[PDB]
Design a protein around this nucleic acid. Structure first.
Ligand code: MG
Ligand code: MG
Ligand code: MG
Ligand code: MG
Length: 49
RNA sequence: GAUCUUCGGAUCACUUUGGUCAAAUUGAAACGAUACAGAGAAGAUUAGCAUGGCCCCUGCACAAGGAUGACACUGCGACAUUGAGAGAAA
């Protein structure tokens, strides 16, 4: 337990240090990812037609 | 027509029309239904003020609210070289 719990906090800390984007960065990129993914299906409909 | 007065002749009164349709689908609000997604500040929860306009609603308002109303970028570069080595073209 004690060896295991030390290794958990050591991995959680590597996440904190790694990313600074915040809520607005993550939600703004998903909007890009949805719009881009939406087109690829929409453009295939144009070639299909 | 009326009043004077020769049956002539006077005199009074003078050009309307507020129209985005000439008869409610195809010429002046959009919202609503549905589907998805589902709320700032570098752990998580959290008050806010501003900031900039081809974004705007509520409001008599130069009060105040509306998520802090919402939305918001950050490669370039006015190009020097040094010294050496290799390559193709004069
Ligand atoms: Mg306000
Ligand atoms: Mg808030
Ligand atoms: Mg409020
Ligand atoms: Mg504001």
């Amino acid at each position: 337990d004690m060896d295991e719990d030390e290794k958990e906090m050591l991995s959680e800390a590597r996440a904190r240090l790694a990313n600074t984007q915040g809520k607005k960065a993550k939600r703004k990129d998903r909007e890009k990812q949805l719009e881009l993914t939406r087109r690829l299906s929409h453009l295939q409909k144009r070639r299909e037609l």
